[PDB]
Write a protein that binds this ligand. Structure first.
Ligand SMILES: *[C@@H]1O[C@H](CO)[C@@H](O[C@@H]2O[C@H](CO)[C@@H](O[C@@H]3O[C@H](CO)[C@@H](O)[C@H](O)[C@@H]3O)[C@H](O)[C@H]2NC(C)=O)[C@H](O)[C@H]1NC(C)=O
Ligand SMILES: *[C@@H]1O[C@H](CO)[C@@H](O[C@@H]2O[C@H](CO)[C@@H](O[C@@H]3O[C@H](CO)[C@@H](O)[C@H](O)[C@@H]3O)[C@H](O)[C@H]2NC(C)=O)[C@H](O)[C@H]1NC(C)=O
Ligand SMILES: *[C@@H]1O[C@H](CO[C@@H]2O[C@@H](C)[C@@H](O)[C@@H](O)[C@@H]2O)[C@@H](O[C@@H]2O[C@H](CO)[C@@H](O)[C@H](O)[C@H]2NC(C)=O)[C@H](O)[C@H]1NC(C)=O
Lengths: 211, 154, 211, 154, 120, 120
């Protein structure tokens, strides 16, 4: 009952933070006293950096162990492959997960943003929506911005990338805003970080609550 | 319109087509849906000759797109050394910051362009400038494995 | 690689078609010799109607088997629990899946519809988006309508129901429309079928491509 | 406005409040966001005595919500036999269709209300009425398991 | 008074407890004449079945169909709830309208592990 | 001429075939000096390794790190590809800058089931 996952860097970490990382997440549903070990290796054999390891036992009694390995921006876009080999004493066979740069057609995102009308009960709250469509590959980062201030990721929910009925991928983003926020400044910006958006890897769109 | 064709011509390297479009009155500082000027694209794509022509026609060397990149940012990313020098000679801001705090020195360190780094430093680049995540170009080079470049950055 | 799934009746089938059904889906990644059998039974022991079975072998080699059972409306809304058992000669145990009426707080959906601006290339096509939010429970059916015609489901894409941290679930629907269609009539309607939309279990919003 | 509380009064069953609100000028055909009238809500909730008050005072007996539901549809769903009669005596379209071709006979068959289907039949309910999915009210009762009802669905 | 029926289905653990302090009927019947004990046994909410047991619900309560909490727990293959109801005392030989016991259900559904718990 | 590299990495088989027929270099090299064969073996695309073999791809091509296509196939724990590559005359005793064979790589990864193939 052990699972392991390896992710590509987020476009935000790679282009905005300029510090890409990959994370090996291991989720043990029923943990024994043995300690999980996560080892890193590159396909070329060139040396891995020093990873960071995190450990948390959740309320349902499961253990989540993560290892975050810094990668090189050069090595990632030039196609290096990284593997994470997981060994635990009570696991009969090792689990290995790999990751590498995305492949296939490359399309820049299209961004549109909307604002819901004033519901009588929602006098002091409004819902803003963002449509990000027709991009490839599927990896993308979504951000909400107000008064030149990044809003926390917890304030909006972004759907998982889905293949369009036509061409590309599309995500949606839902964000609630308060009357105090739009009265201070009635301008909210939805920003997408995506590799295929040239030249700056960002596309954005603004929306106002008041017409 | 002329701005769209000039942006495409400036990106593709279409050298004589930039001149014909500007002869037709195309705005040398035309922008697309994300604030990108033709100088941005010429600097990004590495077209030094079109970069020079655009500057000679009054192109804003410090133009910023919606992320806050100047053409210097883009020339630093792709490592076009001669374009960085011409941008600086025409008055580019070496310490230009984006909406996240990223200076051209940050981008040069991320992509390991040592000789870009030397020139930017010769023109007064703040080695101590932090992005809004609290990191200097020295930090960026270390996080990217460019430890040889980090010695020049401290 | 054998998995089984058992769904509740779609709100459309139960409230609109007036013919609620439950479907048992089995996907066998490596089909070995032997017949898959699917059997139904009710918790009260009352008889079940006659079901329909469908089989289909995809390109990758996998077998997909389905059994759909008609259920009664009064039956379902009064809390009858149904159970599907999947048997194969080369499976160690049998597989069992169960389904019953939704539970918990009940809240009616809010429906908002939006239209994307015209783009130089996409002058003959354009994208409509629908936000259906603050609904409980999580089962929802989404439909787009034009000129008193129900558009085929293959023309739109609807996101999985996602929970706003505090108040209800939200879905998004993306529909591409053609210039031929909005020139015939610039009224496109996004309708939701949901239990708690009282009294008719439908909530809707209209959108126009041009004001 | 006053129309809101009339809607809320008719749904809750507050008979005297409906009369008080109607005397004060409340619109007997006020609608909410789905086109629902107080006659719809009173017929759905089963308040015969508000149903009669609204009908005598100009409430549209064949009003349709945004789905195409007349009050008779909702009365057949919630199995209110006397409301079905009074609605029909006041001129309710017994063969009214919603957007999907659903008649009151369809819904009464779905929820197994034999007493309602024969009142509808008495008032000329079309046994052959087909929803846009091609199913008569006979088919709906068969698929919902009311074979005892499908016998009289001709 | 029948809000405990909806809560037993929903698995609201502590809701059930406050609903019994106010003395919601532990033998309230749904459309299928089944008590909140049936429903919690059917849907696998074990803490709940115990608080209903502590508050004095009939372990041998019968629905319209003659089915006890044991029947519904066997049908749903919730092995522990069967043991608990047995420990608190249930008629294993209880038949239903169609002539079946919890053991007959276990044979029809093919749970030998359940059948072994029942015959011992 | 290096669309074959991305086509080998992406794994679109028919896209590879048509590029190879037009004469695209089967010994094209990425930033690390690896052919389309390296990427196909590493990414577990057996179907393409054979098409490349038909086109005569060097099975012992050395990357900039001195790794053969066999090295990466063992690194990725891809059993059948390794024996295919070995059948086409792979050099087992080749070593990288590190000084490692595919065997050493299965020893580091603890893949003795594949180390048997290399032992065998
Ligand atoms: C309680 O038990 C559930 C088992 O149902 C466990 O939830 C599991 O949580 C992990 C993350 O801790 C999920 O894995 C990964 O989630 C990330 C989210 O960013 C995603 O990137 C990965 O692709 C992967 O999905 C896993 O999906 C989830 N499992 C299920 C069935 O939901 C966990 O032990 C406990 N739950 C929580 C919320 O802690
Ligand atoms: C290749 O074989 C796979 C067999 O797994 C076929 O895909 C499978 O299709 C079924 C039916 O949609 C999927 O069921 C769905 O599963 C999700 C969870 O994964 C569940 O939430 C949904 O309710 C639904 O039951 C099944 O998972 C899916 N497997 C996947 C992920 O591939 C596939 O169609 C075949 N491809 C072709 C066209 O050859
Ligand atoms: C598939 O199973 C059905 C159901 O029979 C039950 O299924 C078992 C898994 C188990 O639950 C037992 O209680 C039953 O045996 C079979 O339908 C039966 O078919 C026979 C003859 O055709 C008939 O006499 C029974 O009355 C049927 N029972 C029902 C409920 O319809 C069916 O034959 C099985 N098919 C195959 C291919 O095995």
């Amino acid at each position: 009952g052990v699972s392991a996952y390896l992710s590509r860097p987020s476009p935000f970490d790679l282009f905005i933070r300029k510090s890409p990382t990959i994370t090996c997440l291991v989720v043990d549903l029923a943990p024994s006293k043995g300690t999980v070990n996560l080892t890193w290796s590159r396909a070329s054999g060139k040396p891995v950096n020093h990873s960071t390891r995190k450990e948390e036992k959740q309320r349902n009694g499961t253990l989540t162990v993560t290892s975050t390995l810094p990668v090189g921006t050069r090595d990632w876009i030039e196609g290096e492959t990284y593997q994470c080999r997981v060994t635990h004493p009570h696991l009969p066979r090792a689990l290995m997960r790999s990751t590498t740069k995305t492949s296939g057609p490359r399309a820049a995102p299209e961004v549109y943003a909307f604002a819901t009308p004033e519901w009588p009960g929602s006098r002091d709250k409004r819902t803003l929506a963002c449509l990000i469509q027709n991009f490839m590959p599927e990896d993308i980062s979504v951000q909400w911005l107000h008064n030149e201030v990044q809003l926390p990721d917890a304030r909006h929910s972004t759907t998982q990338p889905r293949k369009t009925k036509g061409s590309g991928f599309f995500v949606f983003s839902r964000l609630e805003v308060t009357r105090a926020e739009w009265e201070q400044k009635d301008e909210f910006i939805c920003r997408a970080v995506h590799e295929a958006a040239s030249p700056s890897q960002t596309v954005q769109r603004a929306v106002s609550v008041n017409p | 319109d002329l701005g769209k064709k000039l942006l495409e011509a400036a990106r593709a390297g279409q050298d004589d087509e930039v001149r014909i479009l500007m002869a037709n009155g195309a705005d040398v500082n035309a922008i697309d849906h994300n604030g990108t000027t033709p100088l941005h694209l010429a600097a990004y794509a590495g077209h030094l000759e079109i970069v020079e022509v655009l500057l000679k026609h009054g192109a804003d060397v410090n133009a910023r797109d919606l992320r806050g990149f100047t053409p210097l940012h883009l020339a630093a990313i792709d490592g076009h050394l001669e374009i960085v020098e011409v941008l600086l000679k025409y008055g580019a801001d070496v310490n230009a910051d984006d909406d996240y705090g990223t200076t051209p020195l940050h981008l040069a360190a991320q992509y390991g362009h040592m000789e870009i780094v030397e020139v930017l430093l010769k023109y007064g680049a703040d080695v101590n400038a932090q992005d809004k995540f609290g990191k200097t170009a020295f930090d960026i080079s270390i996080d990217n494995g460019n430890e040889d470049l980090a010695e020049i950055l401290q």
